[PDB]
Hints:
homodimer; mainly beta; Jelly Rolls; eight-stranded antiparallel sheet; 18 strands; binds a molecule of 3 linked components (NAG-NAG-MAN); binds methyl alpha-D-galactopyranoside; binds calcium ion; binds manganese (II) ion; sugar binding protein
Amino acid sequence: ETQSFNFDHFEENSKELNLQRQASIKSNGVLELTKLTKNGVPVWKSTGRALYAEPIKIWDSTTGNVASFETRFSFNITQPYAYPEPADGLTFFMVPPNSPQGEDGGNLGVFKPPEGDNAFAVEFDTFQNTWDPQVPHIGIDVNSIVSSKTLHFQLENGGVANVVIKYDSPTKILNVVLAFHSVGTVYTLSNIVDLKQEFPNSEWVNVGLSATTGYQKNAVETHEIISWSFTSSL
Amino acid sequence: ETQSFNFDHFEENSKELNLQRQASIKSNGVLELTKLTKNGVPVWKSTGRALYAEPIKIWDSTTGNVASFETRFSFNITQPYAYPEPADGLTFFMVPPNSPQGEDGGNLGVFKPPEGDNAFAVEFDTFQNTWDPQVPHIGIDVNSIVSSKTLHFQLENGGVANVVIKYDSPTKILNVVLAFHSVGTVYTLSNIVDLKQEFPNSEWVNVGLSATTGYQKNAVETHEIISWSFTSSL
Ligand SMILES: *[C@@H]1O[C@H](CO)[C@@H](O[C@@H]2O[C@H](CO)[C@@H](OC3O[C@H](CO)[C@@H](O)[C@H](O)[C@@H]3O)[C@H](O)[C@H]2NC(C)=O)[C@H](O)[C@H]1NC(C)=O
Ligand SMILES: *[C@@H]1O[C@H](CO)[C@@H](O[C@@H]2O[C@H](CO)[C@@H](O[C@H]3O[C@H](CO)[C@@H](O)[C@H](O)[C@@H]3O)[C@H](O)[C@H]2NC(C)=O)[C@H](O)[C@H]1NC(C)=O
Ligand SMILES: CO[C@H]1O[C@H](CO)[C@H](O)[C@H](O)[C@H]1O
Ligand SMILES: [Ca+2]
Ligand SMILES: [Ca+2]
Ligand SMILES: [Mn+2]
Ligand SMILES: [Mn+2]
């Protein structure tokens, strides 16, 4: 039937959120995906992911139907400095269960250089790689870091961002909306995605949030997740 | 090539807006679509439309190419009372040039009960007719007051609303986003629309904003347009 988790805030232990690497839960009830310092000294090349414990049912083989989902979350990215040049970004992704971790930096901890695992991600790219358009930008990544579509947006440094991602099985429409209410700005980007086709060998996937800091000293930024709700309708 | 008008504010006698009926420009620099008390005495069954002077090229018959466009505007709807109940709503529409007006009330001043002319509109329905779902709601009307898709939303009485309407020719995706920043709420609705087909006998259309008040007395609400920008890319 339906599957829906909601995190008005975050709490340790909570056997619902599965943390990987640098990901951890601050005392603020905030989920910190990456680290800016570790052990007393500055750090970089940090990586963190937070996957939801339960796998989500994307499509059913029996009746050949597909699930229509909607996920919402608030993030706070802060960029300490200008030069070097902050990196790398944040992403919402989906991957088959027990599927290998992605690379660092530009691969937002989700994709691997050699087409390894079917992965789907919605990125918020802060660093311009050799394959990226001006940044920062929103990108719909379908089995590749090379977004199938992108949209440039102004980032409100240290300001709260509201993200809404919606998928309608019937129309195969994936729409992403980014809002910065304080300043009152709205960014909307949509494309066509066929979940069954992009995830042909998996009726179940693990939903998650991922982020990474740069490959060079000080090519970093903060990646905080305040709240996160999701709901699929198969 | 490209076509783009922008109205951070409205100026009286603006040779770029073709005001019709009750539509007029207040001294605030605000565009008032309907009157709730003309000349001082209350008024009902009001109708107003504001069309952009220049026609917009939707599709090129010589190239087969369709135009992608994006329009943005801020509206302020205020509902004086609960009873009887407010009506009828606001809408963004497109129609072939020198095309007949629509009927009052529930037809948002855009459609004619008996399918007369080709029309496309994005409605913000405040009144529930016999063909409507729980109001208020956003509706994508493709040649009919009977929205092909709708989405319910909570109206912020007298609060500013930010609307973003976007169409991508390449994917045929029409997405509508409604934001109330003060309260921080986001409503997103999208469907598939083929402009070339819904407007087969017109390569040009007139872009506009329309609104109407109810039939019964005191079944009125205000319909104000603060700003309005638009841009098509053929
Ligand atoms: C977005 O994320 C950043 C980083 O997580 C949030 O802010 C940081 O704000 C801290 C204040 O709470 C500030 O520092 C500290 O410094 C003060 C004195 O200045 C001490 O009293 C505290 O004990 C603590 O040591 C951090 O320096 C600052 N980080 C950055 C990179 O600027 C910010 O509030 C978040 N935004 C929202 C809306 O939550
Ligand atoms: C959005 O539109 C709202 C409706 O017009 C508007 O509020 C309304 O505010 C006016 C004040 O300008 C109230 O008016 C009356 O008072 C003035 C003097 O203060 C007189 O000149 C008028 O004749 C009248 O007596 C309206 O009553 C009030 N409407 C309601 C339903 O309460 C908002 O302020 C607008 N918001 C923005 C951002 O423009
Ligand atoms: C020069 O590229 C490398 O470093 C920058 C940081 O400066 C980015 O992190 C990028 O992903 C990584 O491949
Ligand atoms: Ca990048
Ligand atoms: Ca209606
Ligand atoms: Mn990118
Ligand atoms: Mn309706």
